[PDB]
Structures are given as structure tokens and as C-alpha cells.
Nucleic acid binder design. Structure first.
Lengths: 127, 206, 98, 79, 61, 151
RNA sequence: AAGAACCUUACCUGGUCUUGACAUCCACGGAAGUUUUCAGAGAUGAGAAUGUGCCUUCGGGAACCGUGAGACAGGUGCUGCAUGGCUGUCGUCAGCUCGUGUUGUGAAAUGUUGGGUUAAGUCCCGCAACGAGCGCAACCCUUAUCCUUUGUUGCCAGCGGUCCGGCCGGGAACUCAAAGGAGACUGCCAGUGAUAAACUGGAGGAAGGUGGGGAUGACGUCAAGUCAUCAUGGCCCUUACGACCAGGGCUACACACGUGCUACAAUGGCGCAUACAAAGAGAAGCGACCUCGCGAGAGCAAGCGGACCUCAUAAAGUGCGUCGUAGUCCGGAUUGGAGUCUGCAACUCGACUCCAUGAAGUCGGAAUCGCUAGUAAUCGUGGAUCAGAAUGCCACGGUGAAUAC
């Protein structure tokens, strides 16, 4: 039956589902490849279907919103590694070595008063 | 000064706002207008009573003003009479039904605005400040304050140069975020001009 | 159906009013949805501190606007009035539409 | 040119203008307003338009339909 | 445009939204005014830190 | 820095092509956060390099880079008299860094077309070992040992 | 100064008033007020109309107006080196000090020197000092992860029903939201280290050695800045340095400099197609949709005081095609003509559209600034201010590095 995995990166919500089968990649009820998957997260999200196994053993259903390209990818990435568990999650132990059991925490740093950006400081006359 | 105000930082933490009525954007300015107006009259009448803190709060779409205090006696007088006499002219200022409850706090020398007016009144007497202020501070520790501190600012003694002079007695742990800090500025007006009176009183840690 | 959308400075306060509408409703009749949470409005200000000059440092301020939504799907019309009115709604603003 | 579907003119000055139109030209009129946009009826008539310290003598001519009173007046002195 | 109606500018010109400034309600300052309290920034700060303004607090987002 | 150590993340290997070295090269080449126009440039340059040279894919830019990797770099230093230029033996990582580093500035400086072509041309006259990258490499060997023993 | 067309605005040239623009206070007469006029640039003076009201005690009185009287009002006038209040700054730098004790004739010293250790007066051991208090630390907010409570205006897997559009039952699983909570404490182990403190490395773990950010600013320094936010000692003018009003000025221009924006292009211009956001704001508001206009925009006009509706159709990016090294299909200054928008008003002195014109610039001297990771860099969006006002400031996210021996 179904194997679920959620995940987030940069405020992008994803929802991954997994069952056995010769899966194509389904994202928001269209293919990721018909979402330009030659470019869009191109091998990036199929990371658990790289290191520990091949692609064509699991059917997959994904629904994602938010971010841009790299914004969209990491929520699906961390949901899909967690959803990789057809017979148990033993492969998380090998993916722990790779690091893809841990999503990248990082977010944009706010603007603050007196800075041009977030660490960028203005220039000032003499010294 | 360069420190943040103790009262303001602790508002979401441990110090209730001194008005607590809710309002929408349309009437928020107008409720704050009557709120800032009442406090002028309220400070003016109750000089002997001496305000601790005030809650201006929402009853049935009108106004209500719970005033805490050192001395209820001048406020109360006979029955509900001299409270009602104030509440009547507040109802005229607010333009709606106004409701007043005066609330005594025992050991009033222990609370900060209340002691500050006592110190500032002896400045109006024109006392020798160096002993007088410290004798006032010692009273709080004697009456079981955990910590207390005072600072004065100005042409003290009528001085040609401006000067400052703190004192502190007990544990007042200012950058500690859990700490309950009661703090108030007040000022005196003299023939040499205005003298600031700052007083910090520390109660507890949770 | 009949619904109450509330508004509050304190999250733990609008919490007590939406507690009171529940236990009032299942007491007097039935059929209340409790507090639907709904996203928070945050009025973020920044203003200049100094009386004069000194642009560089400013102080930021916030007013958290907590909303709640309670609906009653209640058809018991003659106990709806008993649910109505009597509440003081934890000293913070409430509006009750059909 | 600009300023949409038709310009503005000054009411108190317009009654003086009807004297200037009917009776014909006489002298520069001393007017505080600069605001009026000129149209044919002001043509051929001496007026004077303020620059913030004196009324500037404009005699009006043919193409001044394109202009306000104010335009000929210098408000800033130069070397 | 139309007839006598555009010529009705005998108004005080105190009608216009071009006219009223929105000075600080307490102090008359005509700069630093945010509309939400209707005060210039310094009396906003003086009030807010002294805990009078309801529901207002510091920000650390 | 003086005190606490720095050792950053080891970046993504390039998709399909499989070169994490060329992934680092595009990250050095990258103009103004456009990793997209960078990856667009690199494959067009790599095909035009391998097409021109007649060689295979991975070793084409690698052999071009290999000639232009010196074993030393120089540092400005002083202890006694007015400033000295002091040669020092490069880190093997920083060696491959410096070869790639001079390439992007060299590719900007060429008389050539658009960026895929001009970069492939720069790799072409480093594979042939006669252009600007070998000229930038063939400097430090002359300069060393006139100045050997300072730190 | 988070908004100089008038107003703002203080100043000038002009027009005016002097118990006044505003308070407190008396008398006397008049409802307040809604209409209209002539003369004036207007302020205004000078009019005719009309209205002639709630309490009353029949002298009235309160709401309120006009006239006159004298006590007075007024000042962004002066004095920050008379001041409060308030703020910058060195600097969130790790220091700084008092009780007693000892030591010295005494100023004072020690504590707070040592030996190690850290982000750190962080901690151990050692010590003629033991203790205390301010400080960093930590309590907080927000963010990285999980679990519980809750399921509309939000969300949609498994289910049916579908104009097969989350649309309509329904499921509330699951997302999100917001209420409440958990977890990470050097703790787990090993080694090293004066065995102690501590440190290095690894473990396990979503998060490991102050987790990241933000909030949070010691004692004190510059007789710092601020009498124009306000308050205020003292001084001065008080038929003028006050008050009211019109236009003008604050936007000038042989110049110099600061701080920003936009360029000098081919990683790019230009044309078509194609596509993911995040945070906001909104009732004298925002204003779909629909129609009309060359477009700017215009007319008619739903929905919503907002997870709903509106501004609002996020751009860089990506797919194809053109241009090919040129002052260019680069670039936009300047200037012309013809238009739209706001407002009593675009005249000195607004923004914006359309057509036309197409300077300089082909990457900037000596010198100098910023930044160590979601940062630098780069492209969009939003707000406050607001009639109309942005390349500023303030806020949010997209793409996203290099190098630190």
C-alpha cells in the first residue's frame, strides 16, 4: 500500500506518495518532465532512486506548491527520501551517509534598518 | 537613556497594558484620544490619593477606568460619593457612560510611581537630596524590597552645572529577561527649573 | 450557518471566549464547530527614535491581531437566544453574523 | 497641448476684462492672479501679471491663446 | 467642460483635500505622522513604551 | 582566518555529465546568480571544444587545464626592507582553482564571439598550449628564486 | 523632513488687525444656524434675506454668537556653555566596581597578577583574600524537526458523483494555518588534556558543541546633538520679533563634493510562445468583470471591512526566431509637437502617455568602500508617507556564488 512523505524547503509545501510499480514522475497531476523536468530539479529530486536503488520499482504521486526551481525541489526531495520505505526505512541509514535524510535548514535573512540588503553595508565619507 | 524601557519590553511578558480595551481601526484613534484626555484630569484631581497604575478597559461599548492607588481615603470619602463625583465628570469627558473603581495597594512605599511622587514632593520642599533620597530608598529595603535603585538628573542643589547621581541597594537584575521591573520617570519643577527623578523597584523573577 | 468571528490582542484570551461559546452551546443546545484558527494579521511598524537627526537606528513595533471563527450549525432556534447575548466574550471584540 | 478638456480662468478678473473688451484698452490692470489661461478675448489689451513683488506689463497678442498670464513674468532675478 | 458650473470656484479652497495637513494631534508637528495613531512618531514612542496603548508591543521578526 | 577553522560544503556533481569539477568551474564562471545561463554556456562550449579537437568529453578541458596549472604562486611580504614578492608552493586544490580562475577573465578579454564560443576558443588555445592561459602560467617560474628564503 | 505647486512655511515684497489666530474671566445685546449680494486679489470690510431652539425660576440660564472693557494672550524670538526630557557615539566592545579583610606613613594596592582554558572577569586548579553586585551567559520572539488538539472562507490523498474546473457531495485523511506541546543536556562514547577545568574526533540523531536570526546596549566618554516635537530656568519683543491673508521664494547656477539611480551591452538587445512566488494593504477605500479608447486612460459597475473579494496577470528564468561588434535593432540625455491624470489651483513649481529627436557614454585617475553563506551578487513585488506626489527609505521573496593558506 501507500508510503507517504511530506517535507519542506523555503516555505514550499510538498506531499509525496509511493506505491510499487514502473512509475512515471507525477507532479500536480502533470508529469515533471512535462513541467520541463529536463531542467526542473532534473536529477535532483530522484535522489533516493539513485543511491540506494533504481527508479523503475515505485509508482509515485506528488503535489507541491511554492518556491521557484530550487525552491520547489527540496520539499519534494525531503518528502521523497522519507517516502522511500517499501519494506522498512533501513535505507535511511545509508542515505544518512549521503545526508539527504536532513533537509537544508536555511532561509532568507530579513532586511534590517541601515543595511542595503542583509549583510551589505553602505559606504561612508572619510574614516 | 540608552537602555530600553523596562515597562515596554515586559508588556507581553508580565506587565499588563494600562489600557486594555480592544478597538478597530475606525475608532482606535478616538478611543486613544479620550484615553489620553482622561489621564490629564485624573492625574490632576488625585494628587493626594496618588496613582499606582490605571486599567482603562472595555465594558458595554462605553468606558471603564480601574484606578489603583496608595490612598483610597481622599478618593472614597463618604460611601461611593467622591468616586462618583469624579466618575460623573469622566463620563462628560469620555461622552459615554464611565465607570470608576478605586483600588488600594497596601505597603504603598514599596511601589515605584508612589515612592517617586513622595521623593519628588520633598524636592518641592527643597530638601538636602543626598540624605533625603537615600533615606527614602532605605525605607523600601526595610519594608522588604528585593532591590531598588534611584537616579536623579539636573541642576541639583540649584547647581550651575548639570549633574547626575544614582544609588542602588539590593538586587536589580536589569538585562535578565524574566525579571519583574517596576520603573517610572517623574520630574520636579523648581525656581532653577526641572529636575528628573528616576526609580527602579525589583520584585521577583517569575 | 450563524457564526462568530472574533478578534484579539491575546491568543490565550480569545481561547477562553471560544471555550465559553462551546460549553455554552452544548449546554443550552448543540451543534458548534469550535474555533477554526485562521491566519494571524501582524501590523509591523518601524519608526524613527530621535527628536532630531540620527536616521540610522529605528525601533520596530508589532500589534498581533488574533482572529478566531466559530460557527453554530444549530437549528434549535429558541435556545440560540440563550446562547446569544449573555456572554461578555472575555473583554475583547466579537462579531456575530447570520 | 496639456491640462485635459479645457483650462481655468479667474472670475474677479473676468468682470474687469469685460470692461476692457467692451470699452477697449486703457492701461495695464494690476492683477494678483497669474492663474488664468489666455483665450482670444484677452487679445489687444494691456494687463499686468504679478511676479511676487510687481505686476509685469503684458500686452496681449495673437498666439497667446496657447499661454497663461504667468509665463512672461520673471520671479527670479539673475546677473 | 460646461457653462456657469465650472465657474463656481467661489469656494473657500478650504474644501479641498489638497488643503488640510494632518498635523500631530498632540504637538502640531507636520512631519513624522503615521495615520494609524494620528500622532508624530515621538509621542507614539513616548506612549507605547509607557504601556498605555493597548495590545502594542516590540517586534523581533 | 587567524583562529577558527573553515571547511565548506562539497557541491553537487554536474547532472549526467558527472563532473563535479566542471560543476565547480560553472560556479566560478557564474555571472550574477545565473546558474541557468552558466549551465547553458558550458555544454555548448564542451561540445564545441570536443568537436573542434576531435577528442572525448571529460579529458578535453582537463588536458587544456593541465598545462596551465603551475606548482607555485607568489605572495607580497615584508619584514625588513620595502615589500618583497615571495614564491610559495600551491595547494593541489588551489592549483585546479587558479587554472579555472584565470580562464573566465581570459575569456572576457578575447576578440571573439559570444560566451560559449569564446570559452571553447580559450580552452582550444590551452589544449594547443599557446594562448593566454599558458602565458599567465608561464610567469611564476621565472620570478621564483630571486627572493627565495623570506616568509 | 515617513511627501516644499497653494496650504505646508517659519521667510521676502505686498494687503491687514492689535485683549487679537488660541486660553482663562466679566458685562451688555443677540438662538445657534441654513440662504443669497455688491465692492476687493483675497483676507475682508460693507449689505439685504431669513431664522428667532432645548432648561426658566418670567431679573432668566445652559448650548453658542457679536460688540466693548481691563487683568492678559502670543512668539518655530534669544540663551543646549543655565536645563529637564530624549537621542547618537566609542561598542553588545567584556569589562567595571562596592562591602569587609589584609598590605602601605599615605595617595592607594590587593580582590580584578598566577597556571591552564573559552565566544567570554567562560570555567577549574592555585593563591592573602573571602564574599557581593552590575555585566556576557540565560529566561523571550522568530526559524530549522516531530507529535497532540482544531477543520472554514483554507487544504485534497483515498472514495463515489462529476459540463470530470476541488467542482460538488464527502473525507477529514493529508496540506496549511494557530492554539497547545515535545526534543539537544557536552549527554552518549572514545581519546587527548594537571587526574580537575577543558579540548579534539567520532557516535546516535531532523536539529551538536553559544543551533541560526532577531530582541536585549555595563560603569562611563565627547560641558556631543536637540530651547524647531514637547516641557522648561533665565533674557527679550509684546500697535510687534505677535496674529490673519495674496502672490512669490524654499526647485536659482561660472562651480566643488557626498549619497543614490541608469548606462556604456552579445552571459546581451529586440520579437513571439511558455511558468514557479512570498509578503502586504484596502470603505470620502481598493474597484473586478464587462464594454469603449493609439495607449496613458475613460464610461457603466459586482464583490469584500478580507485564509473568501479587490489592488493582483511576480519578474528575472525557460522554448523558438532575429540582430553580429556598430556609438549599433546598443544607449538614453536634451529638445519639439500632440495627449491623459489630480486638485480652488499644473504659471515659476507635478507625475504620467503618445509620436518625433537620438547628446554624452564603447567600462572611469590617484585614491577608496562592502562582504565569510541562503551571505555577496542579481531580478521582481509590497508598504509607510499620500489629493497628486519616488531612482529615496522601510519590508518581503525569487534566482544565487567565489575565496578565507
Amino acid at each position: 500500500n501507500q508510503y507517504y512523505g511530506t517535507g519542506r524547503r523555503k516555505s514550499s509545501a510538498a506531499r509525496v506518495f509511493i506505491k510499487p510499480g514502473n512509475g512515471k514522475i507525477v507532479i500536480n497531476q502533470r508529469s515533471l518532465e512535462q513541467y520541463f523536468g529536463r531542467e526542473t530539479a532534473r536529477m535532483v529530486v530522484r535522489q533516493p532512486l539513485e543511491l540506494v536503488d533504481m527508479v523503475e520499482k515505485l509508482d509515485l504521486y506528488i503535489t507541491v506548491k511554492g518556491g521557484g526551481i530550487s525552491g520547489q525541489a527540496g520539499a519534494i526531495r525531503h518528502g521523497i527520501t522519507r517516502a522511500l520505505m517499501e519494506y522498512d526505512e533501513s535505507l535511511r541509514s545509508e542515505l544518512r551517509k549521503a545526508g539527504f535524510v536532513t533537509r537544508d535548514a536555511r532561509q532568507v535573512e530579513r532586511k534590517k534598518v541601515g543595511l542595503r540588503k542583509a549583510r551589505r553595508r553602505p559606504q561612508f565619507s572619510k574614516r | 537613556g540608552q537602555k530600553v524601557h523596562p515597562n515596554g519590553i515586559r508588556l507581553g511578558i508580565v506587565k499588563p497594558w494600562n489600557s486594555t480595551w480592544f478597538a478597530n481601526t475606525k475608532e482606535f484613534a478616538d478611543n486613544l484620544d479620550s484615553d489620553f484626555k482622561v489621564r490629564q484630569y485624573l492625574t490632576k484631581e488625585l494628587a493626594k490619593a496618588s496613582v499606582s497604575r490605571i486599567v482603562i478597559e472595555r465594558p458595554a461599548k462605553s468606558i471603564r477606568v480601574t484606578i489603583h492607588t496608595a490612598r483610597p481615603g481622599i478618593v472614597i470619602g463618604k460611601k461611593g460619593e467622591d468616586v462618583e463625583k469624579l466618575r460623573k465628570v469622566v463620563a462628560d469627558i469620555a461622552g459615554v457612560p464611565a465607570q470608576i473603581n478605586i483600588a488600594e495597594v497596601r505597603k504603598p512605599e514599596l511601589d515605584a510611581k508612589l515612592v517617586a511622587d513622595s521623593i519628588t514632593s520633598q524636592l518641592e520642599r527643597r530638601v538636602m537630596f543626598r540624605r533625603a533620597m537615600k533615606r527614602a530608598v532605605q525605607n523600601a529595603m526595610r519594608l522588604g524590597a528585593k532591590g531598588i535603585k534611584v537616579e536623579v538628573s539636573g541642576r541639583l542643589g540649584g547647581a550651575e552645572i548639570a549633574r547626575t547621581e544614582w544609588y542602588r541597594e539590593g538586587r536589580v537584575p536589569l538585562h535578565t529577561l524574566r525579571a519583574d521591573i517596576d520603573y517610572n520617570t517623574s520630574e520636579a519643577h523648581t525656581t532653577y527649573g526641572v529636575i528628573g527623578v528616576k526609580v527602579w523597584i525589583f520584585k521577583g523573577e517569575i | 450557518r450563524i457564526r462568530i468571528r472574533l478578534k484579539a490582542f491575546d491568543h490565550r484570551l480569545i481561547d477562553q471566549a471560544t471555550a465559553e461559546i462551546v460549553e455554552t452551546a452544548k449546554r443550552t443546545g448543540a451543534q458548534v464547530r469550535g474555533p477554526i484558527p485562521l491566519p494571524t494579521r501582524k501590523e509591523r511598524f518601524t519608526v524613527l527614535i530621535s527628536p532630531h537627526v540620527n536616521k540610522d537606528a529605528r525601533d520596530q513595533y508589532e500589534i498581533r491581531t488574533h482572529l478566531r471563527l466559530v460557527d453554530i450549525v444549530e437549528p434549535t432556534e429558541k435556545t440560540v437566544d440563550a446562547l446569544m447575548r449573555l456572554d461578555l466574550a472575555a473583554g475583547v471584540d466579537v462579531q456575530i453574523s447570520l | 497641448r496639456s491640462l485635459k478638456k479645457g483650462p481655468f480662468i479667474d472670475l474677479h478678473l473676468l468682470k474687469k476684462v469685460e470692461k476692457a473688451v467692451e470699452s477697449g484698452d486703457k492701461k495695464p490692470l494690476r492683477t494678483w492672479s497669474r492663474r488664468s489661461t489666455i483665450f482670444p478675448n484677452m487679445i489687444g489689451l494691456t494687463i499686468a501679471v504679478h511676479n511676487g513683488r510687481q505686476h509685469v506689463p503684458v500686452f496681449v497678442t495673437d498666439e497667446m491663446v496657447g499661454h497663461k498670464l504667468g509665463e512672461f513674468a520673471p520671479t527670479r532675478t539673475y546677473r | 467642460r460646461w457653462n456657469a458650473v465650472l465657474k463656481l470656484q467661489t469656494l473657500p479652497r478650504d474644501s479641498s483635500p489638497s488643503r488640510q495637513r494632518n498635523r500631530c494631534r498632540q504637538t502640531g508637528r507636520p512631519h513624522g505622522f503615521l495615520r494609524k495613531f494620528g500622532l508624530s512618531r515621538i509621542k507614539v514612542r513616548e506612549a507605547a513604551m509607557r504601556g498605555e496603548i493597548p495590545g502594542l508591543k516590540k517586534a523581533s521578526w | 582566518p587567524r583562529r577558527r577553522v573553515i571547511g565548506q560544503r562539497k557541491i553537487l556533481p554536474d547532472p549526467k555529465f558527472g563532473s563535479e569539477l566542471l560543476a565547480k568551474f560553472v560556479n566560478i564562471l557564474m555571472v550574477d546568480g545565473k546558474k541557468s545561463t552558466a549551465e547553458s554556456i558550458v555544454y555548448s562550449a564542451l561540445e564545441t571544444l570536443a568537436q573542434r579537437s576531435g577528442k572525448s568529453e571529460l579529458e578535453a578541458f582537463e588536458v587544456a587545464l593541465e598545462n596551465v596549472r603551475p606548482t607555485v604562486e607568489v605572495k607580497s611580504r615584508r619584514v625588513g626592507g620595502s615589500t618583497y614578492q615571495v614564491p610559495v608552493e600551491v595547494r593541489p586544490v588551489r592549483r585546479n582553482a587558479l587554472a579555472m580562475r584565470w580562464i573566465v577573465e581570459a575569456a572576457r578579454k578575447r576578440g571573439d564571439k559570444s560566451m560559449a564560443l569564446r570559452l571553447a576558443n580559450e580552452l582550444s588555445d590551452a589544449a594547443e598550449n599557446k594562448g593566454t592561459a599558458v602565458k599567465k602560467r608561464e610567469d611564476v617560474h621565472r620570478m621564483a628564486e630571486a627572493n627565495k628564503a623570506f616568509a
